[PDB]
């Protein structure tokens, strides 16, 4: 069962001085205690499991952040402003304070429109929705890579039916599908078959006894 | 049954033999290479040993690659040797040549 | 490995007695150990802490067979 | 006048411990994951278990 | 060789104990088929695992394995994001140091890269082991040095106000057994140039300073456009089939 992630997991935090002269943006991924004298790759994997758990990435998922948008009051602006990530209002306020320190004038109307429209959702050629938002580098890279890896296993319903069409027995009744499930059906299934021969070869008599006992318990009641 | 039991529980017996060899000092082992013997085992004892082969675990004893009790027992032999030499010298100096 | 430092006074004005005779185990080792080897074997095994056709099996002599296996 | 600077909390480089300490590993900023030193009471002046 | 057998046995016991604790790694049906001989369930799995050592059976890299490998590789490479570095520097306050002044911290403990040469001479490098083994630490600390060959965990608390930038604890601890570096927690404050009190306190109260490479998670507000990133979400018209069975039972 795929999990639809409604929000992008950004980790940007804006830190600004009381004067407002200085400001900075930080990525919060936490501090992980790393030991010495032991291999680093093993600890890296142990921490990577927890990092994936933190980002909602470990379990199979698909992104559903397309609907998180609003539209401006002005009639010319038909653009869809996304609501995820570091909101441009926060950066606008920080920049306004920074310019307030230096006695510079506040951001003009045109500059405000330029800044507040940076995060946007637009359609793509094949129907996907691309959302441009303020986010950290590590979260962006990991989320995109995980999205690709999990997308590798999502296939159309017709392709799956074609793959498993050889193994359907003759006597059973075909299942009708709704036309939507044919035109727009997608299924998440792993299609690699793991060989059972290691266990069977290593301990032959245990597996033979188990399968024979189950089969004969079944057959005896005919 | 015997083959499965032996294949399951051979590492423990190998480790036990290694520890027992680690207990003995070198000089005593060289001395014991001169002697020889033969052990007679009743068939019932052998079939019981192989039919019911207890699994021996020494994981608690070993701290990494170091086990304590074997090192301690092996070290005690140095004190024994020092005592032997000192006592022999003292007796020889005390009594000298002996007549019967 | 290098040894830990003592007190400063024990370094400037410290004296220790010692003996340099390692000794040898030959007087104990050099003998005909044919008769006395088995008692040493039993002590050695005690040094390390351990622990129709079928009803005739009894396990009352397992430790001695284990000792025999180790010695062999 | 006003006191701009009068001493303050001072930072010292080293925390010298007078008490003698048993052997150990790193446990501050650097943490050693290996097994702690194994204490063996070797070199017994009198025989006890032999 | 013996000792290899001892190591293998100990590792096997540790692996079995760890995998069987909490939720067992292995399914119940596999435990049943291994147990059917008469073993305890742990013994059968241990024997099977031992029999599989050094196999040539092909295996498939699942997507989750790739994700974990990617995250672990990025953890190893970009160390600054996770609060640990691999080299640090310790030098007296009287020696000037090039620092990353982009943020504006007062006496910033961050350097863009560790100085290869300072004041026309190379900076000495010491491994953590050799540094701990030392006994003349005063002479070598009179000049300052770069500690490496270890993973130094650190943390910082960026405070909005202006104040003296100093560590929570001391840099170094000397014991008769050895020398250690105490945990590093920076108290970072922002800078007002015209403050004689703070300047004097920084110049006189602090005698030694610890420098680490600048964290990569820190980023100025001025170059915020580099935080812009794109995420693609599939079409909302897709319908997902929970049961992809293509056939019905006869009755």
Numbering used by the authors:
A (entry chain A): 182 to 403
B (entry chain B): 605 to 704
C (entry chain B): 353 to 403, 433 to 453
D (entry chain B1): 52 to 101
E (entry chain A): 705 to 955
What does the paper say about this structure?
Banna virus (BAV) is the prototype Seadornavirus, a class of reoviruses for which there has been little structural study. Here, we report atomic cryo-EM structures of three states of BAV virions—surrounded by 120 spikes (full virions), 60 spikes (partial virions), or no spikes (cores). In the full and partial BAV virions, genomic dsRNA segments and a number of RNA-dependent RNA polymerases (RdRps, VP1) are packaged in a double-layered icosahedral capsid consisting of three proteins (VP2, VP8, and VP10). The spikes protruding from the outer capsid shell are heterohexamers composed of a VP4 trimer capped by a VP9 trimer.
Immediately inside the inner capsid, RdRp is located near the fivefold vertices. Asymmetrical reconstruction focused on icosahedral vertices revealed clear density for a non-transcribing RdRp (VP1) molecule near the fivefold pore within the inner capsid shell, and nearby dsRNA is also visible at low contour levels. Compared with adjacent VP2 subunits in the inner capsid, VP1 shows increased B-factors. Like other reported reovirus RdRps, the N-terminal domain and C-terminal “bracelet” domain cover the BAV RdRp “fingers–palm–thumb core”, forming a cage-like structure with four channels connected to the reaction center. Only one N-terminal tail of a VP2A subunit interacts with the C-terminal bracelet domain of RdRp, near the C5 exit channel, suggesting that BAV RdRp may be less stable within the inner shell compared with other sedoreovirus RdRps.
